[PDB]
Design a protein around this nucleic acid. Structure first.
Ligand SMILES: [Mg+2]
Ligand SMILES: [Mg+2]
Ligand SMILES: [Mg+2]
Ligand SMILES: [Mg+2]
Ligand SMILES: [Mg+2]
Lengths: 204, 123, 80, 157, 47, 82, 129
RNA sequence: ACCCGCAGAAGAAGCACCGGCUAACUCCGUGCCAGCAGCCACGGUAAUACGGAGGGUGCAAGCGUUAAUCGGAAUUACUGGGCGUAAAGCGCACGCAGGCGGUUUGUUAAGUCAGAUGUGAAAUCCCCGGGCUCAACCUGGGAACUGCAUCUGAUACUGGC
RNA sequence: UAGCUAGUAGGUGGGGUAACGGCUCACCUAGGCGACGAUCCCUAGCUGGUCUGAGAGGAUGACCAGCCACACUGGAACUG
């Protein structure tokens, strides 16, 4: 269900600051994100159009930590749903409980957030969920259990969140350790680097 | 293109024939080797190709390519048939799926070994 | 009101028995052309009054024979 | 400001007794991405030079086509040579569904959402020409009104 | 491991017979540069 | 014979019943004449669980329809609730 | 044989549009006249006039706005070889509304849009853009 | 079922591929040999194509494989092909069955369309929510079920008189 | 695969079926079916549906639902 091993290799292959680690240290100082993976790093071949779409898709998958079949399912769901297809796809991708948690600031990395979700720490609506792919509805209050309040990693994550970008569609509390889902995630709040159209085109 | 023409005799669809008639719409088939031999490929190439005339399950004497280098395959041995065609040899529409039944995997191959029935080593 | 159907006589050789054809307008599901489609039926007639090649009005009734299941109500055309 | 992209490159041979000259054909397409599209077809002995030529060609002889906000106005068929193309207006945010070459073509033009298919045989240059023809055919809701001498709203419904 | 003798039922000389069948063909190099040389698409293709 | 009987039309570990009017001898989960409602065996305290059309049931019995014991019990509890 | 008159008329119109003819003359019918009227209403043509007692001749005046033909594409969908009948909700929208379809509607021959508005279907004669 | 307590990453990752298609490339035997391959043929002493090693790519408790079926095939074209030269105009006429039918009026309502009734078992496919910790799943409502039939109409057309 | 068929097709009367009936017997008539493909042969569960497909369609019809058929092959009737 998840990739295991060298995780910054992925973003090196992409060539963009993908936030696949916590990032207290700079992304260029820790790894050569400018260069391609392996021997053929300094080499930069003229990339195909289909190829670029594929790469974008992979980047998106990397971002969330979602394997192919699940991604396909998500895409299908988006297609089923009414309105902007790419936007819909983005929405549920975010809507993944782990991703929501990451956005809030309870796991400093998305993989970390996923792990936290797995390890019985994330308690939505008064029920602790093992599953990361839980789609969160608007006006839902997710709480961190008193068993999980002992951890310093959570605190660190919160601090990181405070330092970084603040989401508008979510409200995070530091001392209370409570999150609030306000509205469905939109393209306006998220960065313009994502190319949902390309992915959509590919998935045909 | 006339609709009336279509009406009284409809579109005779192109009859989809199998590339592998002896397989009888089966993933694999078992056959005893009547002859095991090697013969030259097509004119763009120049080699010697591992092939076996096999007496089939359904009694269908067909020639089949043997994939991989170095084989334990001998005359009067039970083998399993992949339906993969080889354009190098005429009549050859079948691979032999290695590592199955009486036949064993190719020696010392490490990568792409799932096609040639070679086991996972400790390396 | 009960259902009524109209058609023309194919033959009236058989004693107290008529063969009538309904030229029904069928819409083809694949192409869309409207075909005049033959509906050849065995009908019971009284006194053998009709002639060959004659338009008659028939109604749905109980089976009379192996194929017969209609009785005529009125004759629409008589002239040959 | 101007979106510019290479679509296709061929190795095209002028055969002579002294030896076959291996020359490069280059097919590009430019556009601001708001309305105007212009294709360019430049051939040279070299490849970068050829591409430059193509770009230059694209620069002038540019087709001005109005767009329905960010999508196609009406289901238009663009035909050229053997390559016949049907092009359909697609719903909001569904993406450029067109091809490997045609997608790129439409990208420069500025259409975000399209449902397009080339039929029979499709040469890249030919297909681009067909597209262009389709675009030319394609007319705004006000142009049709003008043609009719009528109101746009009324025409719509 | 057999070779299917294109010749078949070999009666006199085996060597000579074999040398006169597909196994010992006249094999010609498809050289570049000169005569019988041109390739529309190379081994690795145009970039 | 004609019977008002419930059929286990649900998944493994997650059960679901549906109160139907059907022939007695025929398969339980196969075919039926008329369905009159449903029954949730989990029976959550928060939101309903049991739902039937009583009038139709009454009509059926007027014209002689047998009631299964469990079904009868359910009907009784519905009446009590009312 | 002179099988389809409406189709012939349409063809004539197309030819006129192509060759930049000011007036096109053709044999006339009541349904034909109605169609012409509908077209006029839609705004494609200047004016239509029928003249002839024994041999009625429909004259059609065409528009060429800004040096180009107004009636760009004009083609029958319903045909003598194959007739197409459409339901109320099944009625097409030719070129996303920017363009029309001639429909044989039971409450007078008219536009597809008009038919939709009414709540009535029928035979979809021609596609006009 | 699910929930409470304990230690420790402890016991749960690998196959397929990297010539172009088709995302990903270098070195060592090898040398039209061995082998590769879905196709265009790699291999002839520098293989980004064999085979291995290293570096990848993409999947993922899988992954290939052949098979089967549909698609892409607008390669049977109702939608949506054609036919001078590419395959494709009977060698040419007459001609019944059938198919197609000019215009005006009346007019049937056959056809068709409209509208209403009955209705199209369910489940699913589909829409809104609902219950599961979400998904797969069960299902509640609603929609659909393109129908088929009856009746009430419509007269613009198709056909019948 | 171009002709098919004498219980064959229809009548009248009888026998019977739970009931209509060539379902069956007597007798008369010479019919009826068919190029809108009868007939003969090859294959086949059919259907609700499932997959695919933009849609139309194309394939397919394990499971789940319904009908039919079959219980060693062939039959045959008794019971209810
Ligand atoms: Mg590549
Ligand atoms: Mg096709
Ligand atoms: Mg010819
Ligand atoms: Mg020729
Ligand atoms: Mg069978």
């Amino acid at each position: 269900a998840r990739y295991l091993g060298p995780k910054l290799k992925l973003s090196r292959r992409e060539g963009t600051d993908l936030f696949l680690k916590s990032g207290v240290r700079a992304i260029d100082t820790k790894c050569k994100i400018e260069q391609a993976p392996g021997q053929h790093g300094a080499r930069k071949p003229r990339l195909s159009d289909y190829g670029v779409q594929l790469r974008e898709k992979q980047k998106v998958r990397r971002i969330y930590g979602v394997l192919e079949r699940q991604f396909r399912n998500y895409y299908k769901e988006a297609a089923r749903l009414k309105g902007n297809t790419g936007e819909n796809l983005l929405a549920l991708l975010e809507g993944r409980l782990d991703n929501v948690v990451y956005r809030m600031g309870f796991g400093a990395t998305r993989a970390e957030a996923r792990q936290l979700v797995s390890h019985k720490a994330i308690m939505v609506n008064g029920r602790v969920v093992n599953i990361a792919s839980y789609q969160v509805s608007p006006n839902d209050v997710v709480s961190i259990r008193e068993k999980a309040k002992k951890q310093s990693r959570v605190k660190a994550a919160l601090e990181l969140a405070e330092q970084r970008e603040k989401p508008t569609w979510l409200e995070v509390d530091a001392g209370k350790m409570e999150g609030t889902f306000k509205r469905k995630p939109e393209r306006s709040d998220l960065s313009a680097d994502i190319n949902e159209h390309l992915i959509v085109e590919l998935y045909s | 293109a006339t609709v009336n023409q279509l009406v009284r005799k409809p579109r005779a669809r192109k009859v989809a024939k199998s590339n592998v008639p002896a397989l009888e719409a089966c993933p694999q088939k078992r056959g005893v080797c009547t002859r095991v031999y090697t013969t030259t490929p097509k004119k763009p190439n120049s080699a010697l190709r591992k092939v076996c005339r096999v007496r089939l399950t359904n009694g269908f004497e067909v020639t089949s390519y043997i994939g991989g280098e170095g084989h334990n395959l001998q005359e009067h041995s039970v083998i399993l048939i992949r339906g993969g065609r080889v354009k190098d040899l005429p009549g050859v529409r079948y691979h032999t799926v290695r590592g199955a039944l009486d036949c064993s995997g190719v020696k010392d191959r490490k990568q792409a070994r799932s096609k040639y029935g070679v086991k996972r080593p400790k390396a | 009101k009960i259902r009524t159907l109209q058609g023309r006589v194919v033959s009236d050789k058989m004693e107290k028995s008529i063969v009538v054809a309904i030229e029904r307008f069928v819409k083809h599901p694949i192409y869309g052309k409207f075909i005049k489609r033959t509906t050849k039926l065995h009908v019971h007639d009284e006194n053998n009054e009709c002639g060959i090649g004659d338009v008659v009005e028939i109604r749905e009734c109980r089976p009379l024979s192996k194929t017969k299941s209609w009785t005529l109500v009125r004759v629409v055309e008589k002239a040959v | 400001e101007l979106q510019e992209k290479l679509i296709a490159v061929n190795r095209v041979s002028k055969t002579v007794k002294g030896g076959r000259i291996f020359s490069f054909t280059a097919l590009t397409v430019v556009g601001d991405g708001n309305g105007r599209v212009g294709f360019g077809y430049g051939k040279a002995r070299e490849v970068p030079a050829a591409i430059q030529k193509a770009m230059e060609k694209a620069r002038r002889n540019m087709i001005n086509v109005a767009l329905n906000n960010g999508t196609l106005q009406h289901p238009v068929k663009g035909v050229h040579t053997g390559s016949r193309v049907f092009m359909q207006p697609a719903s909001e945010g569904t993406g450029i569904i067109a091809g490997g070459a045609m997608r790129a073509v439409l990208e420069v033009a500025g259409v975000h959402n399209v449902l397009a298919k080339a039929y029979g045989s499709t040469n890249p240059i030919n297909v681009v020409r067909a597209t262009i023809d389709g675009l030319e055919n394609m007319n705004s809701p006000e142009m049709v009104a003008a043609k009719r001498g009528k109101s746009v709203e009324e025409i719509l419904g | 491991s057999r070779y299917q003798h294109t010749k078949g039922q070999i009666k006199d000389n085996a060597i000579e017979a074999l040398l006169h069948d597909p196994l010992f063909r006249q094999r010609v190099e498809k050289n570049k540069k000169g005569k019988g040389s041109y390739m529309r698409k190379g081994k690795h293709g145009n970039r | 014979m004609v019977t008002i009987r419930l059929a286990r039309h649900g998944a493994k570990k997650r059960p679901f019943y549906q109160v139907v009017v059907a022939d007695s001898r025929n398969a339980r989960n196969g075919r039926f004449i008329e369905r009159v409602g449903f029954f949730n065996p989990i029976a959550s305290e928060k939101e309903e669980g049991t739902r039937l059309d009583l009038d139709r049931i009454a009509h059926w019995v007027g014209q002689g329809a047998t009631i299964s014991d469990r079904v009868a019990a359910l009907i009784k509890e519905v009446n009590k609730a009312a | 044989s002179m099988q389809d008159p409406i189709a012939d008329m349409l063809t004539r119109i197309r030819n006129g549009q192509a060759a930049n003819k000011a007036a096109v003359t053709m044999p006339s019918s009541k349904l034909k006249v109605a169609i012409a009227n509908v077209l006029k209403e839609e705004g494609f043509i200047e004016d239509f006039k029928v003249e002839g007692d024994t041999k009625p001749e429909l004259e059609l005046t065409l528009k060429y706005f800004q040096g180009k033909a107004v009636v760009e594409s004009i083609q029958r969908v319903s045909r003598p070889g194959l007739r197409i009948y459409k339901r109320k909700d099944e009625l097409p929208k030719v070129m996303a509304g920017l363009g029309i379809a001639v429909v044989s509607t039971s409450k007078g021959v008219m536009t597809d849009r008009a038919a939709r508005q009414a709540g009535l279907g029928g035979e979809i004669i021609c596609y006009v853009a």
